[PDB]
């Protein structure tokens, strides 16, 4: 009897998934790490060479966290002393190694505790942020030019984002942008002077006598937001003037009337930058296209080049206005926007004409634009077979839009339905990444003829190991509700038998534009629960989910905590009605938004669920950040949406929790969804006499991803689920 | 057939113990609040009159928290707007009602947010502290005089104690001491300038968007302590034109040489005051006796009247040097101190004589001196029947120490073996409060011939109700360990059958000088556990416990977390060998110091315990305050006792928790044993892969006593214990 996929297998990673991570360094060569060695590969033939011997930095005296080769291949940036901050931010030390001289640079070194560093897009210029100020080095071993002097910890951020901009807007810590050839350096300046601070204790090692109080500028819903400013400095003039002038580009009058955000920066050409701004009421955004004026040394944005983007049904963009992709001459660009029918498609824009032309359409959506050449635009969409949970690479001819070729659909339709791509520098080659439903498969392709060059990694090793294991299966399908299709997936136990009644665990997330029903292959907790515990783990994408049009996505506009919560309940009913579900053993669990929804469901009084687990849940929207929360809920004021803000809290449902078994979990150092959110849930439950299970994780954040905590929480949750299901 | 004492009975207080709290106002009368009325009783005959009508303040407009009649009966202080702070501290608003003119005073009223107020011991003067400064009012309706001007929140405390002095030294918020007739007002001043602050979050009601951060000057082991100064002011010579003059009384040189504490202030006569100082290394204290000089107007403390008290085996006193009891003329005094055999007895001191004479002796201890006349000294001791857990009132003839008379021993030996007492002004009368082993019995007596005048409260109502309930019994006995006997108590289930096997819960505290095996009658969680769940709840007093001499109490000196932990395991080990104990079902639980011992036991590797519960435990001594920790552990430096500080932690024992079920509980707003302590325990368990149960209580402090949390914690713990024991 073959063994099953156990909890230990998941926690110890016995069945390891292989991947192929490469870095394009040109139009036909890429870097690949193999046995601490860094090899360079010729895309066209697959032949390689040792680029950087693994013994090159033995006597460095430091463990190297990561490396970065300058665009011209002349130097290598070595990162060490890595110290994580939020989701993207961290501090580190850096050394620069001269590849030619093969010596390590020891003069004018990058400062320790550098917040961010980046090579210019061409050559080997460096820009970095230290103590909240920007600096630039024209040559690795020469003195830096200070760009800003206003830098101030927790107050003024130059070239780097504050907490909310890092997390909700740019998904990056950096806030600087080199022009295409590196002449200009643009950046944003965030001012958090009046932004309230979230404060929580950090206990650290046992040896710390007094706990530390972490303090971070974090704007909760309706609170004072940070303000922002944008600038551009000409780095080519740095060695000619004592203090180079950072030219400011002010936001349009339509944004200056109130609170607003800088939400996108994209260079069009060497002398043209585009910026998108968004009103604090995220249903109106403006894109400025600015040109350098060589005579005044200033930047001007012609109103005839200004593009407006608004929404009547919801907010703008999936999570923010989409980025523009400019054609080489910078006179036109492509951008994904939802059409008249509410589906996101590629629109072609002339920079000085307000009406764009859609080049794609249909009841499906474009996920992202991946590359653009003078002849073709390549993109990923979920058009194939009408599966919103699938993803494929497409190629559309710019001189004839009726010519669209799917480059990935038919490569291996049974094993691969969820693709990702990585083009080389001039899109001459591309690596395809298949992530499901079968084992991931990585392949390399030639753009000139779209022919497959070779397989890079097929995961045969794992395929062999999984042969002796009773792996569960996955079912992706849909049910119809109100004449609308809604997708779901089920991780079914091995030897599944429709004639039996299985206990069911509803795995939920359900935030706006989410998708929990896809064709991706995963080895996770649900795998163990299905394979070893014979539990059916299901997920449903109802109202509010994404990639299926604005009619479904904007259904929860200004109404979080309603429809996406109800559809999840309805989904469980529908499932039990399928006849292979033990109606007496139905659980639900989720993390983050998933924990909120799980909590809301357990407190609805539906009677459908027996027990549930909420990890790091949101409990009341006024505790979450302004940018994310307000986008879907507007402002928490009586003149706007306060009533629904006060009506969608978990706490007000405390009483119904007497009907279920609940396990509440939260990391104490969660900087994202503050431990405060669970502290208020527990207090509310204690106040109405409700018993439940709880667990805090000392010094863990929203991810509770430290090696030990990760194993501990899933172990703890397994016991709770087995117990609720009366399983040995 | 009849009911049992259930968990709801404990939580809802179905069975209430009646009390009789009176207040002596003279040597002949006392106040007793009845029907919300204040009656004055004549001790000799028992007749009374109404002193103040419950309806008198019907239209007050504020909920009166408490009252306080001036010594001369002319005024009454009304307390309202009560807001709790720490264990004894709080702020409130006050109003004074003139009992003569039946009118509420409206001129020059005490400020709101007053920190402490107190009448002069005689007459009707007032002294209060507001905004950390001292004020005095000679008359209720007259403008107060400002005594101090250095008051500064969290920095300078005048007339009130800081966090550590409140909790660990004075067991009071007040730091004011009126001379016997009210002429002088002595006060202490605390400076916490360099005392680090403990910081933690307070979430408050759901409506508070941002968690609040509480900051409290709290010196942990080895940290910078607050400094103290002592002053005395003449309240008979205050001027409304000039600022009151305070005379300082510096501490002795043997104290000034290093860190020290003021630990006792006791007026001897109208013009003599005594003070005891303790060195930071708590085994050396000095009592100064100071006399007022009418010529200079200073206070002189003659070196010839200096008294030293030191210890070679541990610290001084039970929790600090004992208080002196001066004779009328103030030329001699009585003080409890451990004799050469290590037992605490009453010693007689001449103020200018170095040697004191013991007036009691034997293998038992005096608990406290209760009253003194020229002919007798009245005290409480555990001498009767050699039971260290019993308490009785005795009087000893000051002219012949061989004549000791027990006054409570024989009153009712079956029902009463534990007494406390309350004497009237000149000890003409005394109230006896019996609290075990039977129901509490309150009686009144006359001193002249020790007549038993009358029964004030015998709890016959409760006795009648308890008859319809299957109440558990209590066994008090001792086991031997190395020729030394150690006492324990067992709360046994109804109809105890020695031929059956009962699960056993070890209820432990075990801090230094503690006692958990006594004759006191109690209705608590254990009552329910034994009466309804048939669980034997036992407690044991081992090395480190009090009232049995220094040989036992000082056994854990400089070694907390060793013998007191081992002895609990030995006791349980011995209980398991008894025929009525199911050695497969033995648990342990404790709170505070008991949470620490319980945790140290569960992590001992003994194998004796199946499960255990720790509520707000200490996890490592460096996290607890200086005054209490150093008393028993010395300083946490390598030159002193750091090595033992480091291996007496719970954390270092994480690994051993694999074979037990552990439930860890703690309130997040605990200002005493910081949540930090449990946060480090959970992190250490997570780090070694040990699963356990946990529960935090939002905004609850060390007592977790708010009505809802109290019910919730005991409910939750009950489920845990019943599950550990396989109980329906
Ligand atoms: C991959 O192989 C190619 C061709 O085999 C290498 O190209 C070299 O091109 C130069 C041109 O000046 C010739 O002199 C060399 O003899 C060629 N090498 C070989 C093996 O033919 C290319 O350098 C190789 N790239 C890597 C990364 O190994
Ligand atoms: C960041 O924004 C704050 C406003 O919140 C600016 O501070 C003000 O600066 C002006 C001009 O010096 C002063 O008159 C005000 O008193 C300041 N207000 C506050 C609340 O401090 C600050 O100058 C901005 N910093 C930068 C670099 O732009
Ligand atoms: C470089 O130029 C900038 C901009 O002129 C200088 O920044 C100003 O510094 C002065 C005095 O230090 C302040 O009063 C202004 O508020 C600053 N303006 C800005 C935009 O920061 C900077 O100090 C100059 N550095 C040097 C070395 O001259
Ligand atoms: C990068 O682009 C910039 C901007 O076009 C170039 O700088 C200009 O160069 C022209 C000469 O071709 C001069 O007439 C302008 O005065 C320059 N403008 C500025 C703002 O510097 C730069 O030469 C380009 N770099 C490279 C390597 O081609
Ligand atoms: C409280 O005791 C003080 C001190 O013994 C009394 O004050 C003294 O009284 C005598 C007689 O009137 C004066 O000659 C002294 O000069 C006073 N000394 C001081 C320091 O004031 C006071 O009278 C007593 N108060 C009461 C109410 O008995
Ligand atoms: C009071 O207790 C302290 C602490 O034990 C004693 O001081 C010294 O402590 C160190 C540390 O163990 C020993 O090495 C010394 O032998 C102790 N004695 C001295 C004089 O330093 C101190 O002796 C105790 N005082 C009394 C009166 O017993
Ligand atoms: C208790 O009873 C006595 C009488 O036995 C009361 O009487 C004494 O005090 C009264 C006023 O306080 C006077 O009217 C009596 O003359 C006086 N008698 C004696 C013998 O002292 C006494 O007041 C009563 N006490 C209370 C508190 O009611
Ligand atoms: C309270 O204690 C502080 C700390 O010792 C006293 O001030 C002292 O410490 C300051 C900062 O540590 C120093 O800057 C001062 O020089 C030092 N002495 C003085 C007189 O400030 C402070 O005075 C004390 N306050 C009172 C009212 O006693
Ligand atoms: C302490 O606060 C109370 C309440 O504010 C003061 O009492 C009065 O309260 C009323 C409203 O309830 C106000 O209109 C008055 O201004 C307050 N003062 C008076 C004299 O009525 C109280 O006076 C305050 N105590 C002190 C010493 O100022
Ligand atoms: C895809 C994209 O471009 N962006 C910018 C995303 C915007 C939402 C981010 C989180 C999901 C969210 N910030 C969070 O942590 N929540 C926790 C509470 C609530 F569920 C949201 C992740 C990046
Ligand atoms: C009897 C007496 O005179 N005094 C001054 C006592 C000294 C200890 C005090 C607490 C018991 C202690 N402070 C505490 O809360 N701990 C928690 C950790 C440790 F168990 C002690 C109570 C008053
Ligand atoms: C590169 O270094 C790794 C780790 O030190 C080692 O396993 C490997 O043998 C080295 N490369 C080669 C080709 O041996
Ligand atoms: C970084 O820190 C190390 C360690 O203290 C120090 O030796 C080195 O000189 C520092 N480098 C820079 C650029 O400051
Ligand atoms: C933007 O959203 C606000 C809030 O609902 C609304 O009042 C306004 O009309 C919206 N503007 C557009 C163009 O939909
Ligand atoms: C005073 O009020 C209480 C209720 O607060 C009431 O029970 C009692 O009867 C009243 N006292 C008198 C003498 O009526
Ligand atoms: C009393 O002393 C304080 C403290 O400096 C001073 O501010 C106040 O003015 C003084 N008042 C008189 C009358 O001297
Ligand atoms: C006596 O018993 C104690 C515990 O009560 C034990 O620790 C000690 O080693 C034994 N022997 C002596 C000589 O004290
Ligand atoms: Na009697």
UniProtKB/Swiss-Prot annotation, chains A, B:
Cellular compartments per GO CC: apical plasma membrane; cell surface; endocytic vesicle; extracellular exosome; extracellular region; focal adhesion; intercellular canaliculus; lamellipodium
Activity regulation information from UniProt: Inhibited by GPC3 and diprotin A.
Reported impact of residue 167 to K: Inhibits dipeptidyl peptidase activity
Topology of the protein relative to the lipid bilayer: Single-pass type II membrane protein
Catalytically driven reaction(s): Release of an N-terminal dipeptide, Xaa-Yaa-|-Zaa-, from a polypeptide, preferentially when Yaa is Pro, provided Zaa is neither Pro nor hydroxyproline
Main location: membrane
Domain of life: Eukaryota
PROSITE patterns with a match to the protein in the record: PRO_ENDOPEP_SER
Swiss-Prot/TrEMBL keywords: Aminopeptidase, Cell adhesion, Cell junction, Cell membrane, Cell projection, Disulfide bond, Glycoprotein, Host-virus interaction, Hydrolase, Membrane, Protease, Receptor, Secreted, Serine protease, Signal-anchor, Transmembrane, Transmembrane helix
SUPFAM superfamilies, per the entry: alpha/beta-Hydrolases, DPP6 N-terminal domain-like
EC number of the protein: 3.4.14.5
Class of the enzyme per the UniProt entry, highest EC level: hydrolase
Induction note: Up-regulated by IL12/interleukin-12 on activated T-cells. IL12-activated cells expressed enhanced levels of DPP4 but not mRNAs. Down-regulated by TNF. Up-regulated in migratory endothelial cells and in the invasive endothelial cells in tumors. Induced by hypoxia.
Subunit structure: Monomer. Homodimer. Heterodimer with Seprase (FAP). Requires homodimerization for optimal dipeptidyl peptidase activity and T-cell costimulation. Found in a membrane raft complex, at least composed of BCL10, CARD11, DPP4 and IKBKB. Associates with collagen. Interacts with PTPRC; the interaction is enhanced in an interleukin-12-dependent manner in activated lymphocytes. Interacts (via extracellular domain) with ADA; does not inhibit its dipeptidyl peptidase activity. Interacts with CAV1 (via the N-terminus); the interaction is direct.
Domain statement: The extracellular cysteine-rich region is necessary for association with collagen, dimer formation and optimal dipeptidyl peptidase activity.
Family of this protein: Belongs to the peptidase S9B family. DPPIV subfamily.
Protein name as catalogued: Dipeptidyl peptidase 4
Natural source organism: Homo sapiens
């Amino acid at each position: 009897t073959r063994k099953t996929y156990t909890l230990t297998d998941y926690l110890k990673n016995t069945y390891r998934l292989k991947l192929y991570s490469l870095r394009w360094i040109s139009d036909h060569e890429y870097l690949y790490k193999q046995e601490n060695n860094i090899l360079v590969f010729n895309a066209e033939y697959g032949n390689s060479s040792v680029f950087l011997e693994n013994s090159t930095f033995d006597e460095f005296g430091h463990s190297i966290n990561d490396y970065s080769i300058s665009p011209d291949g002349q130097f290598i940036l070595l990162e060490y002393n890595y110290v994580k901050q939020w989701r993207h931010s961290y501090t580190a030390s850096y050394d620069i190694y001269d590849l030619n001289k093969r010596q390590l640079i020891t003069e004018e070194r990058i400062p320790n505790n550098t917040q961010w560093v980046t090579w210019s897009p061409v050559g080997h210029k460096l820009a970095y942020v230290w103590n909240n100020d920007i600096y630039v080095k024209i040559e690795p071993n020469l003195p830096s030019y200070r760009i800003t002097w206003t830098g101030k910890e927790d107050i003024i951020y130059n070239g780097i984002t504050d907490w909310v901009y890092e997390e909700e807007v740019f998904s990056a810590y950096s806030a600087l942008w080199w022009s295409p050839n590196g002449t200009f350096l643009a950046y944003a300046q965030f001012n958090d002077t009046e932004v309230p601070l979230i404060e929580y204790s950090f206990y650290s090692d046992e040896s710390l006598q007094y706990p530390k109080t972490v303090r971070v500028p974090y704007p909760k819903a309706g609170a004072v937001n940070p303000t922002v400013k944008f600038f551009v400095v000409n780095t080519d003039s740095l060695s000619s003037v004592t203090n180079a002038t950072s030219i400011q580009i002010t936001a349009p009058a339509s944004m200056l009337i109130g609170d607003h955000y800088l939400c996108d920066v994209t260079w069009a050409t060497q002398e043209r930058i585009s910026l998108q701004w968004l009103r604090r009421i995220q249903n109106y955004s403006v894109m400025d296209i600015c040109d350098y004026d060589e005579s005044s040394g200033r930047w001007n944005c012609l109103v005839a080049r200004q593009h407006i983007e608004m929404s009547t049904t919801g907010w703008v963009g999936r999570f923010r206005p989409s980025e523009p992709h400019f054609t080489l001459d910078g006179n036109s660009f492509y951008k994904i926007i939802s059409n008249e029918e509410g589906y996101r498609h590629i629109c072609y824009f002339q920079i000085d004409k307000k009406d764009c032309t859609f080049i794609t359409k249909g009841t499906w959506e474009v996920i992202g634009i991946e590359a653009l050449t003078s002849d073709y635009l390549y993109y990923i969409s979920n058009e194939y077979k009408g599966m919103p949970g699938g993803r494929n690479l497409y190629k559309i001819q710019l001189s004839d839009y009726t010519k669209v070729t799917c480059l990935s659909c038919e490569l291996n339709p049974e094993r691969c339905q969820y693709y990702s791509v990585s083009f080389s520098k001039e899109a001459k080659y591309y690596q395809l990444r298949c992530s499901g439903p079968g084992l991931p498969l990585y392949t390399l392709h030639s753009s000139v003829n779209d022919k497959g060059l070779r397989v890079l990694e097929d995961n045969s090793a794992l395929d062999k190991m999984l042969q002796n294991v009773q792996m569960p299966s996955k079912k992706l399908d849909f049910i119809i509700l109100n004449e609308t299709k809604f997708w779901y997936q089920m991780i079914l136990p091995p030897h599944f038998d429709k004639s039996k009644k299985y206990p069911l665990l509803l795995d939920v997330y359900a935030g706006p534009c989410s998708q929990k029903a896809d064709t991706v292959f995963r080895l996770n907790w649900a795998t163990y629960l299905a394979s070893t515990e014979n539990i059916i783990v299901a997920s449903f994408d109802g109202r509010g989910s994404g990639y299926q049009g604005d009619k479904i996505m904007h259904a929860i506009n200004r109404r979080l905590g309603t429809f996406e919560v109800e559809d999840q309940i309805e989904a469980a009913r529908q499932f039990s009605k399928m006849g292979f579900v033990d109606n007496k053993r139905i659980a639900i669990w989720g993390w983050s938004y998933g924990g909120y929804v799980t909590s809301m469901v357990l407190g609805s009084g539906s009677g459908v669920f027996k027990c549930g687990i909420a990890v790091a849940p949101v409990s009341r929207w006024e505790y979450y950040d302004s940018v994310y929360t307000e986008r879907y809920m507007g402002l928490p004021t009586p003149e706007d949406n306060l009533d629904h803000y006060r009506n969608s809290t978990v706490m007000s449902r405390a009483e119904n929790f007497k009907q279920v078994e609940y396990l509440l979990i939260h990391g104490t150092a969660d900087d994202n969804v503050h431990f405060q959110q669970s502290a208020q849930i527990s207090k509310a439950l204690v106040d109405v006499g409700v018993d439940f299970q709880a667990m805090w994780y000392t010094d863990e954040d929203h991810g509770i991803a430290s090696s030990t905590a990760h194993q501990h929480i899933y172990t703890h949750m397994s016991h709770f689920i087995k117990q609720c299901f009366s399983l040995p």
